[PDB]
Amino acid sequence: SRCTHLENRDFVTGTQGTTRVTLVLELGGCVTITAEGKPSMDVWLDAIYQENPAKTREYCLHAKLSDTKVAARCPTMGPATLTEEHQGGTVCKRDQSDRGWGNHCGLFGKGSIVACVKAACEAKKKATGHVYDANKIVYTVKVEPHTGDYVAANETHSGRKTASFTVSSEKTILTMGEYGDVSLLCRVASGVDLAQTVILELDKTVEHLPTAWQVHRDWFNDLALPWKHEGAQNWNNAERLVEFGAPHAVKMDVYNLGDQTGVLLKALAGVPVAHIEGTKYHLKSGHVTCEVGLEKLKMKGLTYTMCDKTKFTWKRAPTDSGHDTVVMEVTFSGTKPCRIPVRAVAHGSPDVNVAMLITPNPTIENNGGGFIEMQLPPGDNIIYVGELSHQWFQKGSSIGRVFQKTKKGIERLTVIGEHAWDFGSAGGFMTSIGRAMHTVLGGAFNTLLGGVGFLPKILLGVAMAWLGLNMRNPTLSMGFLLSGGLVLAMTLGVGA
Amino acid sequence: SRCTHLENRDFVTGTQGTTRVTLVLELGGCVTITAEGKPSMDVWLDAIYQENPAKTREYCLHAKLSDTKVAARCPTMGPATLTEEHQGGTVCKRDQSDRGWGNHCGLFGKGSIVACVKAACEAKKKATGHVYDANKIVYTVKVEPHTGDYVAANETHSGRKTASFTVSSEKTILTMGEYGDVSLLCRVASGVDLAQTVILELDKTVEHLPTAWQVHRDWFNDLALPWKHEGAQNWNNAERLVEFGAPHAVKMDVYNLGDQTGVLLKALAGVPVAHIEGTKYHLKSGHVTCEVGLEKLKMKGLTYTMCDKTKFTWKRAPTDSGHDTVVMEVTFSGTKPCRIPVRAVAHGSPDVNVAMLITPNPTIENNGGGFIEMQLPPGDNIIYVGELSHQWFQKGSSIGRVFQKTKKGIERLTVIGEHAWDFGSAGGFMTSIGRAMHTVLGGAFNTLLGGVGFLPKILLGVAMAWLGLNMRNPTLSMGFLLSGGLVLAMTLGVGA
Amino acid sequence: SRCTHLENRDFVTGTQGTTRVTLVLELGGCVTITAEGKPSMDVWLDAIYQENPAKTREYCLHAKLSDTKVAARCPTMGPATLTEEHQGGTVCKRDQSDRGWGNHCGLFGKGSIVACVKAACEAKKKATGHVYDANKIVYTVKVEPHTGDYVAANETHSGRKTASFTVSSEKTILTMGEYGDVSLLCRVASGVDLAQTVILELDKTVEHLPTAWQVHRDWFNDLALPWKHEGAQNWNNAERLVEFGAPHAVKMDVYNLGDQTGVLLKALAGVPVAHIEGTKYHLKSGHVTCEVGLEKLKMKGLTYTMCDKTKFTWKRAPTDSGHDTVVMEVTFSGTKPCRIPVRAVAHGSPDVNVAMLITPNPTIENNGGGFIEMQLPPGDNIIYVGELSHQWFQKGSSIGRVFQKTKKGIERLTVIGEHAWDFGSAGGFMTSIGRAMHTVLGGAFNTLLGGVGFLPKILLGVAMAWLGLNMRNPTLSMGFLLSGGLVLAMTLGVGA
Amino acid sequence: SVLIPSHAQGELTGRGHKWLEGDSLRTHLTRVEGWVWKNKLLALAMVTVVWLTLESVVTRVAVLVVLLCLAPVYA
Amino acid sequence: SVLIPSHAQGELTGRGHKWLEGDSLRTHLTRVEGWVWKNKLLALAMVTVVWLTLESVVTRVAVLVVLLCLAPVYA
Amino acid sequence: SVLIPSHAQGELTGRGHKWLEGDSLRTHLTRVEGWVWKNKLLALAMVTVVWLTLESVVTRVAVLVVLLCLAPVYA
C-alpha cells in the first residue's frame, strides 16, 4: 500500500449503499477507500503535465552592449541625429550639452547631443514563460489494491493500475484480476485554473537550481524588463538594463545595470516549484475532483480454507505506522492458499475482538501475502495470528484522534479552499450550506483584499478593529469589530 | 582662461592693500582671484589621490558550489555525521526526514539527515573595499594667469604651473613667468573626511560601468554577503548565498540564491563615482581650504605704447560668456608690442568708461594676445577697441545680480557644510559665530539623524511640528515648533 | 518732400539752443523736423532686413503616402511583426482584429494586426521658418531736405541721402549738399524683439499670396504637424497626417488627412506681412530709436536779393494737404537766383504776418524752386506772393488741433508701447513718471494675463467687477472694481 | 536570504557625478502623483473620510500628508 | 532602472516544495530590531518623547509600533 | 473667407464605419482630464474663489461641475 510510504494519507469509509465516492485527489496526497464487504483501495493523483506547452514572453536578465556612437551640434545649429536612431536592436538618448568657445563653438549656451548603443541578451540569460492548453493537458491517477504484500518506495507493484485523463476521455474501467473492476471519472475542466498560472524557465543546465517555477499571470505580464516573443531577432521594450551618463560637451558614456537573476529569484520567494523532463512540463502542486465507483468489486478467496493456527511465525513484528495504526508481516509453512485467522483483544477480557482491519479478509497466496494493518483502541492489547501472540500498547486517546481529524480538515480547507467540501462518501444537505457560505464570505475577502500584502492586511485589520472600540454607535462598533476579526482570521491562515 | 570652460565658475576679489585671500578649492570648481593692480589669476583643484591604498574587507557576489555530500540515519539510530562538518569553506545543515519501511528503516518516525557543500567565489565576482591614509594622500592645485591669449579644452597652455600638497608639504612658491611669484598654503586637514570614506572596486575590466564608487564606511561594514580579509582562503558567513531544500527520505537539495546577489544598482543609487588609473585611486568629489598670497605678483607691459587706433579688426566679435561677462578677441597690424586702448560707455554721459576689465592692462605681444573679458552695468552700452566699436545689451538687472550671487552662496553652503565660511578675501570676527553655529547645529543634526532616509526625516519633522502644536506646556510647544521646522528645512535644503 | 506722400506724418519743433532731437522711426511712418532757423528735413525708416537668415523648422502641409503593407496573426499566436516598423520614413499602428472559423483561425477571439505606410511631403507643400541674427540685420534710414522743388512719388529726387545701420556703427554724418551736414545715431538693439519673430515662408512662386508672414515664435513651435530641420531626409511626427481605419480580419485601411494649406492661411489671420526679394528678407512692421543732430546744417540763399513782386504766376493754386497745412506752387519770370516774398494775413490787421512756414527762406533757383508749404490759423485769411493774392478759409479750430495731436499720441502708445515716451526734442518731468507707470502697470498685465484670449479677458474683467460689487469687504471691493476696470481698458485698447 | 540597504543620502558632496542620481524628493513626489492617479478610488475615499472625521484643515492635511504616502511599503 | 516586485505569498496551492519560506514575522522582526540596534539615539528619543507627550497608553502603543514598522522600509 | 461647421451626431448609420470618430463625450472628458494635469495649479484659483464667495456646499459643487467642464474651451 502506497499510502504507508507517504507522510500524508486519508481514509474514506463506504458503509453499505456506498456504490460511489467523491474525492479531491492532490499531488503530495494519497487516499484509501475502505468499504463494507469490499477490498480496500489506494487512490492518488500521480502527475499533471503537458508535452511542449506554448511559449509566451521571453524576458532578458543580462544585457550585452556593443558599438556605442555619439554625435553633437553647436548651439543654434539645430538638433543632432544619427543613422542608428531609427534602426532595430538599438537604445538612444537625446540630451543637452553645455557648450562655449573652449569646446570649439561660436556661442555660449546649450547645444544638442545624441548617443546610441546596440543591445542583446547574454547567451543563456533568458527567462521564458510557458502556458498550458486545457485540450492537451494530461492528469494521471493511479490505484493499487490491498494484496496483503509489501514493497518499498523504489520497486514495482504488479497490481498497480494507471488511468490517464484528458478532456477527450469519459468514465474508464481498470481490471484488477480476482478483485473485480474499479470504474473511475476525472473532471479535467474542474482541476487547476490554467487561465491564471504560468510556468517559468530560466536555464535548465544550472546544477544548483530547480528546473522551473510556477507563477501568477498578472505578476508575469508586468515585470519591468526587456521582452520578446519566439523567433523575433530584436528586443521590444524601452530599455531598462541600459542607462546614460550625464552629458559632457562632446561625449556621453553608456552604462549596463548588470545581471538581474538574483533580484528575480528573491522576488519569486514563496512560489511553488515545478519540473521539466525532456519535453514534459509538470506541475508539482495541483488537484482534481474525481468520482470512484465500487459495485463491480469482489473479495478474493472468500471460499478458501482456514490456516493451521500453529504454523505461523513472524517476518516483521508489530510497529506503529505514524497514522494511528499497527503494521506487521507474518509467514506460514502449511499448504499456501488460505485465510489468515487475525484477531486482537483488550487485555483481561478475552471475549470481544477489537481489530478494526484496514485489509479486509487477509490471505496467504502461493507467491505472496502476509502483510496486515489494523487500528486498535488506546491502552493494553494482545494481537493474534493463530497461536502467535504479541502484546501491544497503543498510544493516544479518543480525544486525540478527534483532534487529529479536526486538524487535518482545517489543513485541507486551507490548502484547497471551496472544493474541500466535495471530499467524501456523502453529499447531504449541510454540505450545500457549507459550500455556499464559504463561497460568499470567502469571496468577499478575496474581492476586497486580493493581492494586498500580509503585513499591511494585519495592520489594516488591527487598526480597523481598534477604531471599532470607540465608534459613534454600538451597531457600527460591533459590525467593524466582527469584520476585523474575520480579516485577521482569513489573513493568519493562508490569506497572505 | 580655463575659468571660462566650466559652468560652475566663481569670482572673489582683494580690496585696496589686501595681500592675502582664503579659498575653498573643489574638484569640478574654478576660482578667478583679482586684486587692484595685480594680474588676474585662476586657481583650481585638479586631483585628490593615493597610490595602492590599503585593502579592507572583500565580499563575494556569486558563489560557486561543488562536491556536495549527504548522510542519513534510521529512527532511533542517533544523529548522522560527516567529516565535512569540521572543515573550512563548507556550508552544512542538519535536519530531520520522515522515515519508514518504504525507505528501508525498521521503525516509522523521524530520522536525521545532514547535507554539505563547498563554497568559493566565481572567478572575477568579488567586491573590494579600499581605505585612504592621511599620511600618503596627494592634493593637486594648479594656477594660471590671465595672459590675454585663448586656448581650448584640448590645448596645452604655457602659463599653467602646479603644486602637490600632502602632510609633509603644506606651502609652495610658483614662478608665473613675467607675472612674478605666487604663494600657496594648503592643508590635508579640511577637505575629505578619510575616516568615513571607502573606495569600492568591483571589476576594472568591464566595458560599461564606472571603475569605482565613494561608499560610506558605516554602510559598507553591514553588507549581508559572504566576506573575508585579504589572503584568507575561506569565506566567513558563506551560508548567506546557499539555501537547503526540504529533506526527502535519504536525499536533500542544495540551491544558490543566484549570481550578482549583491551591491550593483539600487543599493548604490546617489553614491559619488571614483576613478582608478594604474596605481592611482582618485576621488571625484572633494575639496581643500587654501590661502593665496598676492604680494609678489607683477603687471606686464605698463612701459608699452598704445596701439595705432585704426589698425584693429575683430577675430571673435563680442559674446556673452554665460557668467554675466562679455568676451571678445581682436587682431591688429603694426609695431608689435603694444597696449590695447579698451573702454565701454552708456547713453547717460560719454566720459565715463564703465568697463571693469577682468584681463587687466590688455596687450598684443609678438606671438599673440588681444583676448579680453569685461563686466558691464545692465542695459545698453557701446564697446570700443581703438576705431572698432560695437553696440551691446547686457541682460538682467542690479537686483537679478544679487539673486544669482545669493544662490551660488547657498549652493556652496549646502554642499561643503561648516568649511564654506573659509571662502573669502576677509576673515573678520563675524565669521567666527557663523562657523561656530554650523559646528554646533550640523554636528547635532548629523549625530541624531545622519543615517536616516530623506522620507522618514520629513515624517519625523512633521511629527515634531505636530507634537509642538498639541503640547500643553508653552516652552516645550515652542521648542518642538522651532526644532521641527529646522529639521524639515535642513532635510529639504540639499539645493537651490 | 516725401512726408506729403504718406498718410502718417509727425511734426517736431525746437529753439536755436536745442541742437539734438530724439525720434522713434517706424515703417510706414514719417517725421518732419522744424527747429528754429535750421533748414527743415524729412526723416524715415525705409527697410529692416537681413540677407539669407538661418532656417529653423520645416513643416509638411500635404502628406504623400505610398507602398502600404499589412500583417496579421491568429488568436493566441502572439503579436504580428513586420520589417517596415524599423525604418526611417514609415508610419505604423498595431491593433487587435476579430478572428474565427470564417477567416481561417482555430479559435474565436482577438488576433493581432499591424499596418505600415511610407510618408513624404508633396513637392512644394512645405512651410519653412526663418530667424534673424542680430549681428547681420541692416536698418536703412533716409533723409531729404526741403529744397523747395516738388518731386512726386514714383520718381527720383536728387537730394535724398541714405545711411545703413548694423550692430557695428555709431554716429554717421551725411552731407546734405549745400545745406551742410546731419549727424545721426541708431540704437540697433531694442524696440523689435528679434528673439520672438519668425519669418514664415510657404511658396514664393504662388501668384496670389504674400511671400512671407511675421509669426510669433511661441506659436510656431506648437504647430501640430510633421516636422524636420534642413538636410534631413525623414519627417518627425508623420502620424499627425495619417489616420488608420477600423481593423478587418486581415486588412486595415490607411487614410490621408489631405492638404492643410487652407487651415494654416486661416490660422494666420491677424499676423503682419513680410517680403522676400532675391537674397533679402524684409520686415514690413516695427521701429528703431534715433538721435539726430542739427548743428552743422546751413541755411541756403540768405545772401540773395528779393524777387520782383510783379512777375509771379500760380502753377498749383493753394490746396489742403490733409495735414493741417496749405500747399502751393509758383512760377517766376525775373532774374535768378532770388528770394520769394511770401506772407499771409488775417482780416483783422494787414501788418501782422501769420504764416508759419514749413519751407524756410524759399527761393527760385536757375533750374528749380517755387514750392511752399505753410500752416495758417483758423478762420478767413489772404496769402500773398508779391502781387499774387489768394483767399483761404482755414478749416478746424484751436481745440480741434489739441484733440488731433492728442489722439495720434494714443496711436503711438498702443502701437509702440513703452518707446512712445522717447519721442521728443526736449525733456520734461511728467515723461519720467509716464514711463515708470507704463512699464510697471503694463508689465503687470503682460505678466499675469498676457497670452489669454480676448473674450476670456473680458469675461475675467466682468467677473472681477462682479466680485467687486458682491464681496462684503469694502477695501477688497474697491480694489476689484479699480483693477477690473484697468484690465478691461487695456484689453479693449488692443482689440480683436 | 540577503538584505542590502539603499545608501543614505548624506555622504554626497562636490560637483562630480552621482551615479544613477536617484534624488528622492523629485523621484518620490513624481511616484506619489502617478500612484494616486492609479489608486484613484482609494485616494477619494481617504480624502473624504478624513474631511468628515477631523475638525480643521490643519489636522485634515497633517494626517493626509502621511496617509497618502504609506505607499512605499503598502500597495 | 529594473524593478521586480515580490510575488503574493498566498494565492497558490500547497503540498509541494516552495522555493523559499515567505517573509512572515521573520523578515519584519529582524529588519526592525536590526534598525533599533543602529539608530539607537533616535530610537530612544522617539520612544521617550512619544511616551512623555501622548495622553494614553493605547495611543502611545499604537504610535510606537507605527513609527518603528515604517522606519527601515525605504529604497 | 470660407468657414464650415461640423454637424451634430444626428445621422447615425448604426453598424457601418464612422470616418475619424470624433465622438464628443469621451473626447471632451479626455480633454478635461488632460487639461487638469497640464494646467494643474489653475484649479486652485477656481475652487478657492467659489469656496470663499458661495454660501453652501450644494451651490459650490453646482458651479464647479459646470465651470471645470467649460474651462478647456478657452486659453
Numbering used by the authors:
A (entry chain A), B (entry chain B), C (entry chain C): 1 to 496
D (entry chain E), E (entry chain D), F (entry chain F): 1 to 75
Mind quoting what the paper says about this structure?
The E protein is a class II fusion protein and the largest of the structural proteins. It is the main protein responsible for receptor binding and fusion, as well as the major target for neutralizing antibodies. The prM protein is a precursor that is cleaved by the host cell protease furin into mature M protein and a pr peptide.
We designed a chimeric virus based on the infectious clone of LGTV, replacing the prM protein and the ecto-E protein with those of TBEV strain 93/783 (24). We determined the structures of LGTV and chimeric LGTVT:prME using cryogenic electron microscopy (cryo-EM) and three-dimensional image reconstruction. The electron micrographs of virus preparations contained mainly intact spherical virions with a size of ~50 nm in diameter, along with some broken particles. We generated a 3.22 Å resolution map of LGTVT:prME and a 3.82 Å resolution map of LGTV. The new models included two extra residues in the C-terminus of the E protein (residues 495 and 496), and the LGTVT:prME model has one more residue in the C-terminus of the M protein (residue 75). Both structures are consistent with those of TBEV, with the root mean square deviation (RMSD) of Cα atoms across protein chains below 0.7 Å for the E proteins and below 1.5 Å for the M proteins. The ordered lipid head groups are also present in similar positions; hence, there are no major structural rearrangements in the chimeric virus compared to the TBEV Kuutsalo-14 isolate. Mass spectrometry analysis of LGTVT:prME confirmed the presence of N-linked glycosylation at position Asn154 of the E-protein. The TBEV strain 93/783 that was used to generate the chimeric virus has an unusual amino acid substitution on the surface of the E protein (Ala83Thr), which is a putative site for O-linked glycosylation; however, we did not detect O-linked glycosylation of TBEV prM or E ectodomains in viruses produced in A549 Mavs-/- cells or in primary murine neurons. Furthermore, no corresponding densities were observed in the structural reconstructions.
